[PDB]
Design a protein around this motif. Structure first.
Motif, PDB file in Angstrom:
ATOM      1  N   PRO A 165       0.844  -1.197   0.000  1.00  0.00           N
ATOM      2  CA  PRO A 165       0.000   0.000   0.000  1.00  0.00           C
ATOM      3  C   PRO A 165       0.873   1.237   0.000  1.00  0.00           C
ATOM      4  CG  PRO A 165      -0.497  -1.528   1.840  1.00  0.00           C
ATOM      5  CD  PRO A 165       0.842  -1.871   1.304  1.00  0.00           C
ATOM      6  N   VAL A 201      -5.358  -5.384   6.226  1.00  0.00           N
ATOM      7  CA  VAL A 201      -4.584  -4.791   5.158  1.00  0.00           C
ATOM      8  C   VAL A 201      -4.638  -5.728   3.974  1.00  0.00           C
ATOM      9  CG1 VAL A 201      -2.641  -5.908   6.131  1.00  0.00           C
ATOM     10  CG2 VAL A 201      -2.321  -4.079   4.427  1.00  0.00           C
ATOM     11  N   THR A 202      -4.652  -5.160   2.784  1.00  0.00           N
ATOM     12  CA  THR A 202      -4.613  -5.958   1.578  1.00  0.00           C
ATOM     13  C   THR A 202      -3.337  -5.686   0.813  1.00  0.00           C
ATOM     14  OG1 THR A 202      -6.961  -6.257   1.386  1.00  0.00           O
ATOM     15  CG2 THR A 202      -5.630  -6.319  -0.646  1.00  0.00           C
ATOM     16  N   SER A 224      -4.028 -11.264  -5.013  1.00  0.00           N
ATOM     17  CA  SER A 224      -4.441 -10.457  -3.875  1.00  0.00           C
ATOM     18  C   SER A 224      -4.443 -11.312  -2.617  1.00  0.00           C
ATOM     19  CB  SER A 224      -5.843  -9.862  -4.113  1.00  0.00           C
ATOM     20  OG  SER A 224      -6.584  -9.725  -2.897  1.00  0.00           O
ATOM     21  N   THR A 227      -5.191 -10.764   1.709  1.00  0.00           N
ATOM     22  CA  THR A 227      -5.674  -9.857   2.733  1.00  0.00           C
ATOM     23  C   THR A 227      -5.440 -10.507   4.084  1.00  0.00           C
ATOM     24  OG1 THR A 227      -7.311  -8.832   1.287  1.00  0.00           O
ATOM     25  CG2 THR A 227      -7.649  -8.653   3.639  1.00  0.00           C
ATOM     26  N   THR A 263     -14.513  -4.292  -2.027  1.00  0.00           N
ATOM     27  CA  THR A 263     -13.530  -3.741  -1.107  1.00  0.00           C
ATOM     28  C   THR A 263     -12.343  -3.283  -1.950  1.00  0.00           C
ATOM     29  OG1 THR A 263     -14.295  -5.253   0.631  1.00  0.00           O
ATOM     30  CG2 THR A 263     -12.195  -4.159   0.943  1.00  0.00           C
ATOM     31  N   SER A 295      -8.813  -1.561  -3.170  1.00  0.00           N
ATOM     32  CA  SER A 295      -7.426  -1.361  -2.796  1.00  0.00           C
ATOM     33  C   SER A 295      -6.705  -0.885  -4.039  1.00  0.00           C
ATOM     34  CB  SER A 295      -6.796  -2.643  -2.258  1.00  0.00           C
ATOM     35  OG  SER A 295      -7.487  -3.093  -1.111  1.00  0.00           O
ATOM     36  N   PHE A 322      -2.911   0.313  -5.595  1.00  0.00           N
ATOM     37  CA  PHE A 322      -1.499   0.074  -5.332  1.00  0.00           C
ATOM     38  C   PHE A 322      -0.676   0.804  -6.384  1.00  0.00           C
ATOM     39  CE2 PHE A 322      -3.874  -3.426  -3.591  1.00  0.00           C
ATOM     40  CZ  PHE A 322      -3.370  -3.544  -2.312  1.00  0.00           C
ATOM     41  N   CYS A 345      -5.772  -1.721  -9.174  1.00  0.00           N
ATOM     42  CA  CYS A 345      -6.947  -1.512  -8.343  1.00  0.00           C
ATOM     43  C   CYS A 345      -7.602  -2.867  -8.106  1.00  0.00           C
ATOM     44  CB  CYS A 345      -7.910  -0.558  -9.051  1.00  0.00           C
ATOM     45  SG  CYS A 345      -9.161   0.362  -8.056  1.00  0.00           S
ATOM     46  N   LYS A 403     -10.805   4.881  -4.521  1.00  0.00           N
ATOM     47  CA  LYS A 403      -9.526   4.881  -3.836  1.00  0.00           C
ATOM     48  C   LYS A 403      -8.515   5.581  -4.727  1.00  0.00           C
ATOM     49  CE  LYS A 403      -9.940   2.758   0.141  1.00  0.00           C
ATOM     50  NZ  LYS A 403     -11.423   2.710   0.220  1.00  0.00           N
TER      51      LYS A 403
END
Ligand SMILES: [Br-]
Ligand SMILES: [Br-]
Ligand SMILES: [Br-]
Ligand SMILES: [Br-]
Lengths: 440, 221, 211, 440, 222, 211
Positions: free
Chosen positions: B133, B143-144, B187, B189, C113, C115, C117, C133, C206
């Motif tokens: 991140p 957190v992912t 991904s 998490t 959800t 996120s 990066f 994303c 985001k």
């Protein structure tokens, strides 16, 4: 009755010890005999094979040396059976069946050395004949011998020790201890009247005779064919269609062994010189066939695995079968000392293998191995023609260890013994004693 | 009781290649093995079968020696070798153990599959870039993190995190092709406590180039 | 060759329903088999001999048919049953497969959800720039993603990708990947991806700033 | 009687087509019967386990429902047998055997229900009884039923469909076709007089039954023990030693069950309510033992591969043997519907297993596997307690496919039947039919 | 064929331990018992132990405790032998045999090639290879005897071949002899008078324990 | 346990000739097996269960005996039969082998072909000097060698090595190696090498001088 029954039970399976101790020795003496018979038989086939090398260049000279070597031993056989013991021709199992019924004589001083040495000339010359008739006969005459020698009294003692001799004599010819007992039980006992043959004593007989064969043969088996595959239930009907084909052919072959029995007797008319001379021509032809067409001659144990594994073509099976159909009659209808038990197995194997190869090409969805129809069909002649399906199956089972096929085997076995009854066939071994009581 | 096939990857059109299936957990003999294939996104299609003693062999309506099936029971292995390849043998190849119930035969146990690509292009190992991140203090309960796997050929790759330790929380996305190259991301998490407190690395592996890349996910200091 | 044809190529259903798919054949077959193939997995023998259940198949499954109609039935389907199912006959060589009935699942709404990066260091040392994303665990699959660069709208160099339906929570995921060059990336600042989904009338967004 | 024979020989094996078709339907029913009986006994036994889990918290409460559910099913099956068919108690083989001496009636309107359901009660509760007794008697009556229905005449069809019933009956109990056919011949048939049982029919009986078992029971074998070692000739002498042991123990076993009957009859005197109460007592105990010492309860077919593999302690083998002998008496001497055949295998195995262990730890020059000495002694209590060794041998052969042990299996059997005969021993099935006929 | 090929043997220091490995090819390794039998140099065959196919019964000669650890790995078709606490008495040639029977008295059916286990505190060392041409004025006869000296190596052994083993006839290498923890042995080739110095005679010595290949040519003296 | 003691520990005999050896036992033994070992080759099982040959074994071989004494025999021996014969029992446990019986070819005598060799220049540079003497191709195997240094005997630093009986000519051979430091070697000039046989009473002297 109910009173008669109650004390009959109380007193069952009490075979007299003297019968038992005398049943051991019978088996001991038949094993040795049977072994020594087998050893002899081979040893001479070797000489035939050895004298082929010594004359291995003049191809015409070779044809005749295996003719003669076998023509000679062929003749020595027909003679020692005509001069000293007429009832020791052919199989000799009819004879012992008759003997159990008290309808035939047991001349062991005459049969044991006539069969033993007569056989080695017809077997050892490589004639389509098994060692089974010979060994079962020798084994019963052996069993009559210790009845005489020890002067035991009874029909129980006389019928028991005559049978265990014949059972321990079939075991040691195949290494088939169960199919020994089951032959007594299913075929050779008096088939229309009760009998005091002690099963428990037939047993002790087969044990010694087998223990004898294993002392002189062990770590080896007569047929090895591996573990074949399994038989799906949606394929079991093919093993019924196989028995149906065997059910129709079974009696036809019974006719031809009787029919040809007479048509060789016309030749010699009965005369010991016209006969022995014909048989050395057959025997000379068997030692000669066994050099160009080894699969068309000899007992036939050789081509049973070589057939099961699908090692032949379709044509070679058609050929080998029709040839063997012929050379089987010539050797047994001629009355030379030697069974048709082994040479029928070979016929049965050859047949089923042919049936399997056909099945394989018609039904790829069954993922078939023809070796299973060979194993099914192997004891199928024995069920359709001499009509002993139970003994026949437990025979093939004891020699091939493919017990997963016990169902397809049992179904083909019935499908012969049924379609043979529905088309007019006969226990060949009782249609012999039939014609041999009809002239007498 | 397992079936593990291999040998797949890249072939030039018209070429040939030999696939292999390693059996374990059972008598590999006394069992018909078979090959089935699946074109990318399509359905199953029988290729061939072979009885235990290499005595019987069958194939689908193919051509001369399009397919050839071997077995060396000594090493418990099935073989398949396709020749004169063309874009429709691009497929995933399954190795199945045959068997029957009443006797109508089925594919009992299937292998994992080796993947075959028929293309002109060149074998290329992937690059694995870590996805941390941005330095944006936005703590949640979780957190992912991800990692990015770019520019490899041919398919597939395998993405695991911490050697599968984190089975739960992982999404690996299907590759997308561009300029005859594949790219995909994955991904993961995890709780906000478990990171960066404890180590999180993504295990990439591209067998068609015999390459593994264990990239480790660090924050953007 | 027999041609097996399975009746709904794609069916959605909601746990608790009774679900039935059907295998129909060009001529007569008998004792057919069924294989279950969940996403990214080798097929599993699931029902064989028309109606027998491979050990380990839960009793909510059943098979039936004859002649040319054959069916599989899930009685109160549960959500771990999502897969493409395949039938197969072998009563006629060569045996032949069906073509699949992909069972999709219907579930409650679930919001994504997001996120974002930024491109990673190593990727910049190597001359590229990709902005990733993530959009995790949303239902339904319909979703649209907008890439705003400094408030502007980029539409060339964006690739998205979706997972299959997850086999225990039935959700979908998605990943949107904007790819640029090193210089093209370093000549802007405020990147953002905007996520639009029926679980909210206002899109989730985001962003990150290069500074 | 020479010409009487020639005519009988020519007319041998021509069973009437209708009797062949009729054994076909008997087998097909007897099969479906034993399949259902087996599926049944299973479901009941399983619902018994499903209760322990609904209650696994309170361990005393656990030991209570383990008792009662067996007690309930025990009583129920005792009751069902006294209130409606008393010859359906105990095993049911003596009755079918008497039914061939025409001394006992085949009341098939009553026993079919009373055996099957009473059986499902006693067996389904985890009592020490073999589903073989039931399936035999049931199978016979199913044969009688098709007789009394199609009104077929003749001592042939009556004695035959009576037989194929029982044979197909035993076949479906052990997936052992040959063992059932041989059961009729060595044991079931009337042993003091000739008979007209068409054996070919008994085959068609057994085949169909065996098929029906395979239709619901393939790809799982009752016992899978794998391919154990061979036995070299210089170890045979040890198997005959194992036979001797069973020979002196077979008869010591027969005595107990007899006395244990008396001792158990003294308990209820005949009164149905003491008896049924005594049943649920025994029954519940087995249900309890089944939960706390499961080797001491149940049919015994379970721990037969466990004992072979060498997975039991030697203490265990002694324990099991003592404890199982103890419960085997309670369960079978009590008269509860159900056979003794399947529990007699277990006692035999558990003994031969413990023999091999000692037999190994004394003779490592021999390189022994204790598993061979179990397989020998599986069909061993079947030789010195019921003196039908030719069936146990072939029965064991059918269940374990380890033919290489034919000699020691045979040998060990003759060892037990000879010494059973010699220490004053009566065959078990016969010695039951007697005490019955004497009370009648 | 039916081949037993054992490996793993060589040089270990006393009190040590090794793990010999017998690998099978040409039959079903299960359903056969396997056995180890070693042989001290110039001594009888001593039996070590045996193991049955399911590994359920392992037997060893009357000797000590974790000294021998026989195990087999049925799946690799391989048989293992672990010697611990290795002594000088354990310096021997270790054979791997499959066990079988007849009338029931057991025998050692098929053996393998062997592997050689040397147990000494002495250190590996390469050989020095010196020629052996005959005296400057030797009795040149019709058959001339050559040779080379392989001096001071450890442990055993060395291959000694001449002209890449073409001159296989007329050659003998003598046994090595151990002195002060080192080995020395000479070879001998005989060729006709016309052959040398006419052509070239070489001796090819190989001590692989130390990665020594060396050819040393033989030239006449003075 | 069961000690086996094979009696004629070594022996020779001609071809086409009857050969016989022995196995005794401290206790009673039933069935003894025999293996033939040639140097460098795996032992071969030769004869088992007292008497029984094996596949390949020439029929000239034979076994006999009983109880606590058994015996092997070659009726008209060949060349190939020269080797070692080990009896092994397993009537009792544990099994035991015998010491062995070495069977060597017997031929007509032959005298040694002695060869003496001066230390090479390479060995001298390194600082030692070894004088090798080759006693080659003689029957029987008994022999003596003697070294003389300027005609005076030396018994220090000598090492002799016999071969096993040869393959082709069925002779033996024997190397004698005299190892001095370089310095001690240059104190003297005559190195002599003296082979004493049974073929003659006159040793085969070979020597040389450096001059
Ligand atoms: Br005849
Ligand atoms: Br015959
Ligand atoms: Br009873
Ligand atoms: Br019973």
């Amino acid at each position: 009755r109910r009173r008669q029954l109650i004390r009959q039970l109380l007193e069952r399976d009490k075979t007299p010890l003297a019968i038992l101790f005398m049943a051991a020795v019978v088996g001991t003496l038949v094993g040795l005999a049977a072994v020594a018979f087998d050893k002899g038989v081979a040893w001479l086939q070797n000489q035939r094979m050895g004298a082929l090398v010594h004359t291995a260049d003049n191809y015409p000279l070779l044809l005749t040396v295996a003719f003669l070597c076998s023509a000679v031993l062929a003749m020595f056989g027909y003679f020692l059976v005509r001069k000293y013991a007429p009832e020791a021709g052919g199989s000799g199992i009819p004879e012992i069946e008759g003997a159990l019924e008290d309808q035939r004589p047991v001349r062991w001083w005459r049969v044991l050395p006539v069969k033993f040495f007569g056989g080695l000339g017809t077997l050892g010359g490589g004639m389509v004949l098994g060692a089974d008739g010979p060994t079962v006969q020798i084994g019963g005459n052996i069993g009559r011998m210790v009845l005489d020698i020890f002067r035991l009294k009874g029909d129980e003692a006389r019928h028991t020790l005559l049978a265990t001799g014949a059972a321990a004599g079939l075991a040691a010819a195949f290494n088939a201890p169960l199919a020994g007992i089951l032959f007594i039980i299913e075929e050779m006992r008096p088939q229309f009247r009760y009998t005091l043959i002690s099963i428990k004593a037939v047993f002790i007989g087969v044990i010694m005779s087998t223990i004898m064969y294993r002392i002189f043969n062990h770590e080896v088996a007569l047929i090895d064919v591996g573990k074949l595959s399994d038989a799906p239930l949606n394929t079991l009907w093919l093993y019924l269609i196989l028995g149906i084909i065997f059910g129709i052919f079974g009696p036809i072959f019974n006719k031809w062994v009787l029919g040809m029995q007479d048509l060789l007797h016309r030749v010699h008319g009965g005369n010991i010189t016209k006969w022995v001379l014909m048989g050395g021509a057959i025997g000379g032809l068997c030692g000669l066939l066994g050099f160009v067409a080894p699969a068309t001659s000899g007992g036939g144990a050789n081509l049973i695995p070589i057939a099961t594994a699908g090692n032949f073509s379709m044509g070679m099976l058609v050929f080998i079968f029709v040839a063997r159909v012929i050379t089987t009659l010539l050797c047994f209808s001629s009355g030379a000392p030697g069974g048709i038990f082994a040479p029928m197995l070979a016929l049965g194997t050859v047949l089923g293998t042919a049936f399997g190869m056909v099945a394989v090409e018609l039904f790829p969805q069954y993922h078939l191995e023809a070796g299973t129809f060979a194993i099914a069909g192997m004891g199928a002649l024995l069920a359709a023609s001499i009509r002993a399906p139970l003994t026949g199956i437990i025979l093939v089972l004891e020699m091939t260890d493919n017990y997963q096929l016990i169902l397809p085997m049992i179904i083909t076995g019935l499908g012969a013994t049924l379609l043979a009854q529905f088309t007019g066939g006969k226990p060949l071994y009782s249609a012999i004693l039939a014609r041999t009581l009809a002239k007498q | 009781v397992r079936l593990l096939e291999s040998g797949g990857g890249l072939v030039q059109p018209g070429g040939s290649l030999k696939l292999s299936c390693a059996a374990s957990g059972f008598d590999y003999s006394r069992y018909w093995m078979s090959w089935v294939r699946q074109a990318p996104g399509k359905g199953l299609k029988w290729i061939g079968e072979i009885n235990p003693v290499s005595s019987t062999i069958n194939y689908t309506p193919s051509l001369k020696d399009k397919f050839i099936i071997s077995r060396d029971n000594a090493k418990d292995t099935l073989y398949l070798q396709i020749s004169k390849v063309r874009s429709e043998d691009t497929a995933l190849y399954y190795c199945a153990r045959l068997y029957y119930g009443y006797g109508y035969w089925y594919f009992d146990v299937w292998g994992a599959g080796t993947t075959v690509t028929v293309s002109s292009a060149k074998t290329t190992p992937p690059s694995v870039y870590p996805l941390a991140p941005g330095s944006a203090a936005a703590a949640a309960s979780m957190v992912t993190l991800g990692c990015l796997v770019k520019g490899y050929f041919p398919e597939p790759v395998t993405v695991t995190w911490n050697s599968g330790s984190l089975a739960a929380g992982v999404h690996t996305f299907p590759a997308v092709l561009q300029a005859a190259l594949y790219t995909l991301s994955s991904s993961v998490t995890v709780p906000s406590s478990s990171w960066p407190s404890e180590t999180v690395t993504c295990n990439v592996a591209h067998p068609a180039s015999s390459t593994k890349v264990d990239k480790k996910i660090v924050p953007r200091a | 060759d027999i041609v097996l044809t399975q009746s709904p190529a794609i069916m959605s259903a909601a746990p608790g329903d009774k679900v039935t798919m059907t295998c129909s054949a060009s001529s007569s077959v008998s004792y057919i088999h069924w294989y279950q193939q969940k996403s990214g997995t080798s097929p599993k023998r699931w029902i064989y001999d028309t109606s027998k259940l491979t050990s380990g198949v839960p009793v909510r499954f059943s098979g039936s048919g004859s002649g040319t109609s054959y069916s599989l039935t899930i009685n109160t389907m549960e959500a771990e049953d999502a897969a493409t199912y395949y039938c197969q006959q072998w009563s006629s060589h060569p045996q032949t497969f069906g073509g699949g009935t992909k069972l999709e699942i219907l579930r409650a709404d679930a919001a994504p959800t997001v996120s974002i990066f930024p491109p990673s260091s190593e990727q910049l040392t190597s001359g590229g720039a990709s902005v990733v994303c993530f959009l995790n665990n949303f239902y339904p699959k319909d979703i649209n993603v907008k890439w705003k660069i400094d408030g502007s709208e980029r539409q060339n160099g964006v690739l998205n990708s979706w997972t299959d339906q997850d086999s225990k929570d039935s959700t979908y995921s998605m990943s949107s990947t904007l790819t640029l060059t090193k210089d093209e990336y370093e000549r802007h600042n405020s990147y953002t991806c905007e996520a639009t989904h029926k679980t909210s009338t206002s899109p989730i967004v985001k962003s990150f700033n290069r500074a």
